[PDB]
Symmetry: C2
């Protein structure tokens, strides 16, 4: 009885909505992506939404279009505790990533950003790690104080709130992901949401060949564009999943709460969930091992896998990859290293019932006792 760390959660209505699209003659560039984009705007309380084939494609369109590029303003500060894509797309946009420290919770350290700004600094890119909001008030005030763009990678955090308001409209722009195992899914897919109308329209054309309507037969191209559209089949699934996002988020919060209960005051590791101040998407359920276990990681992990718990680790500090060590040869950050050595993401998704969570939790405990 094997448990992936996350799974898609599709139901009858989701399937019904996909079938409906298979019966029509518009498979792409149609009503359903617009409908999906409108429903996100409503859901998040923002003005503008664009859906893409992936969040990685959405990150790129944002990075390329928030402002024009200047070799004099070429550094962007971001976290090294993110999926590599957050960084890879900076490089594809011509920026140099500058890596900040993080906190116990895995989020970018709002205190340690000051130290790192210089003349080259163009933006801060934050990540709502595990779906937990970063300290928005701070980064905003800092970004204003320094004429910096605030960009939010909120891939994990569709549904998450900060001071009882849903993440999405705190930054110049925010990226979400609808990858298979994310809070809601379109199989693959992402979005950029924004309150700036000019940004929206500019990254709308980047998304689709830079084609402006004209004759009906003829169009105009003033700038480059790709084909990063999200098709109608995946838009229908998105609509359908969105309509139940608060229910799905609550099923995960329930899993989190069962874990907390059973894990309370254990001698082995610190779960992050009880430390939440606002509502979270609960994309991941992280535990942070105590130092004594660091040299056991792999053995701890293999021992979990053998019990059917396919635990993962989020994330390897980005600067540690070969690509980043060749380009920047970055000096390690202790906040990053410690978190990486400590973090384990346990199974957490909407489809896990009480029994499975109980079994998994008790079983995690047996694993750590196995050592000492």
């Amino acid at each position: 009885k094997e448990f992936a760390y996350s799974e898609p959660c599709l139901d009858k209505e989701d399937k019904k909505a996909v079938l409906e699209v298979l019966n029509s003659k518009q498979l792409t560039q149609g009503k359903r992506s617009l409908l999906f984009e409108e429903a996100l705007c409503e859901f998040l309380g923002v003005k503008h939404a664009l859906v893409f084939n992936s969040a990685t494609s959405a990150l790129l369109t944002l990075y390329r279009n928030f402002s024009e590029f200047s070799a004099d303003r070429n550094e962007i500060i971001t976290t090294p505790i993110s999926f590599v894509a957050t960084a890879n797309m900076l490089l594809e946009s011509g920026y140099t990533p500058v890596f900040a420290g993080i906190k116990n919770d895995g989020n970018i350290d709002e205190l340690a950003l000051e130290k790192l700004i210089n003349e080259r600094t163009k933006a801060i890119v934050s990540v709502d790690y595990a779906g937990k909001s970063v300290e928005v008030e701070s980064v905003q005030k800092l970004c204003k104080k320094h004429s910096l763009s605030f960009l939010s990678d909120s891939s994990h955090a569709l549904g998450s709130e900060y001071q009882n308001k849903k993440v999405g409209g705190f930054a110049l722009a925010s990226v979400f992901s609808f990858h298979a195992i994310k809070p809601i899914t379109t199989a693959e897919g992402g979005a950029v949401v924004t309150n700036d109308s000019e940004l929206h329209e500019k990254m709308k054309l980047f998304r689709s060949h830079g084609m402006l309507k004209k004759d009906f037969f003829e169009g105009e191209v003033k700038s480059i564009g790709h084909n990063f559209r999200l098709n109608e089949i995946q838009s229908a699934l998105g609509l359908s999943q969105l309509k139940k996002a608060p229910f799905l988020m609550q099923k995960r919060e329930e899993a989190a709460l069962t874990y907390d209960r059973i894990f309370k005051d254990n001698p082995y590791f610190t779960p992050l969930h009880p430390l939440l101040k606002d509502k979270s998407s609960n994309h991941l359920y992280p535990i942070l091992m105590h130092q004594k276990f660091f040299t056991c990681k792999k053995l701890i992990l293999e021992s979990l896998h053998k019990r059917g718990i396919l635990a993962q680790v989020h994330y390897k500090p980005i600067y540690q990859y070969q690509l980043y060590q060749q380009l920047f040869n970055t000096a390690p950050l202790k906040s990053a290293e410690d978190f990486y050595h400590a973090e384990i993401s346990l199974p957490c998704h909407a489809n896990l019932n009480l029994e499975s969570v109980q079994n998994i939790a008790h079983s995690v405990l047996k694993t750590f006792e196995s050592f000492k």
Copy 2:
């Protein structure tokens, strides 16, 4: 009724294939894209196939990866008669397009190509117009001679043939589209096929974050990559569609033959379909107006639309786009400007029955008669 120039043609097994995926816990990065890639290899007779979210992503991926970029060899020759993405992706790859001349069959003229090869030339990019294969054997030589890469944008041409051999394994790599209205669809999708194993592996990495699998928990990244994966839902549809690609192509062929019959010896335009010498995918059915009609295109098309025929023109020559003026200022080519004014694409797709074709054809003639 209202006739769009092309449509998807899905059936009950297409619909059944998609449901099997929704019932599964694997919606992306799964068996089915591998299977679809495999089935594309078997269909084409090539060693490697990679599927992407769109043909534009496949192009960028090929363009960025077929060789390392050098400011010295920064010129790639291509046709101006192609969808824009063909060039937008050259710009994004830092190359400069050199627009060649076209034949009146819409294809890049394989003779006006030597004139253009200089010191900074890296590759030739042909487009298989309307599914018609370019003069492959003649391009393979001009590229072998001048040490250039041959890259084929065969977007429209899955199923097409050259000297009774499937288009796909003639170039260094070939790109196909599975967009909603292409020979087969995955709604949105594309592919790069190749017989070059090193290039396959490199493009595979570019398609997915550059992530190399180490053990279960860790990987390595040595070069950037994106997220241009095709998911399991569309792969499943791809497979179901590919299995009937020959049937669908033969429906489009029959529709073209009907047009051909009704249009025989007409005094208004010349259709391209009868001119073929090899099997084509028939992605479009192009007709070329006689010179004396160029002057009224706007009114001829509006009255075609008026009768319900949603005809289209492929293509506005790429250099005419504001963007390409600002950059290269390109002086018009006589062959491409002509073809542009002459061309109208009539509806052509697998679901267009005999009555419909016989009606559209009749309406087309009536519209030209009234001028």
